[PDB]
């Protein structure tokens, strides 16, 4: 298939891997920090989803250095993946408009 769809699919699979690894790594980093809430895997996975999407309900967040570094990777993976799907949609439309126009 075309590159842009393959990159999107790949980005999605990769995003999902980062969400899972990120939930797990966040708990490892945050336990040991008094006051931390990002300490059980189920809510950490939810946290990873809210981080990759930038939804920002604000109910959970890292307080340690490594928990924050993990958070940054999840954000960037999420922003990039959704940015890449947009770029893929644009490429699709540009090609179609070319066809609809006789080129």
């Amino acid at each position, epitope marked *: 298939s075309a590159l842009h769809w393959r990159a999107a699919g790949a980005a999605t699979v990769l995003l999902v891997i980062v969400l899972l690894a990120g939930s797990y790594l966040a708990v*490892l980093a945050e*336990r040991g920090a008094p006051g931390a809430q990002l*300490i059980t895997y189920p809510r950490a996975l939810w946290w990873s989803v809210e981080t990759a999407t930038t939804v920002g309900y604000g109910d959970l967040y890292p307080v340690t250095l490594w928990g924050r570094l993990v958070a940054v990777v999840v954000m960037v993976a999420g922003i990039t993946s959704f940015g890449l799907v947009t770029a893929a949609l644009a490429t699709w439309f540009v090609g179609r408009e070319q066809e609809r126009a006789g080129h």
Partner: antibody
Amino acid sequence: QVQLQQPGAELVKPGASVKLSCKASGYTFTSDWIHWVKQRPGHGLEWIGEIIPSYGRANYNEKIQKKATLTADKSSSTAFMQLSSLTSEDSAVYYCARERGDGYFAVWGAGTTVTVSS
Amino acid sequence: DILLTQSPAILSVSPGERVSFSCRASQSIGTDIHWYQQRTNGSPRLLIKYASESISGIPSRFSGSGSGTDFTLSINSVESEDIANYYCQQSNRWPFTFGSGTKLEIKR
């Protein structure tokens, strides 16, 4: 069948150290945490610390004098707690418990009675 | 760290009566409270998780409720085997902490 196996007792001379063990069977995941809880006679349960065997990381009750050091041997599925320089205050039953990373202690060991005496 | 207060320390009830144990947290912890039962010389046993969720193997008589800072563990129709110490434990913030325990007494 018994999920968590602990020795019945350990006698320790004042000033000496002892290594308690907690052998796990049943389902085992890379995400399990093994906790240790202390209970002095007539008293409640006091959380001592925790360890995730798959990684080797340990956390401790910071609020109490640190008497313990946690380690784990992945090949024998055993978690250990090194108690050092003990006094009669350290005499108590020490439980190990398994937590699936979701906050509660699903199953507990029978406990090891530690007596600090000469 | 979160202080879990269990008062009263001893609860006396008559046979077959509904009984309620109280557990109060120093700050809001959602429903991240779990209950354990510990009979004489036995090890703790999980009774209720996340305030009101059932554990397989535990009698229907046991139930839990509450959210925020105030929690309750109830037993419909107390019977002799229920004589024990009851503890609450939170997992909302690190480190996990335990309540001071409530002993159940039956007046026969």
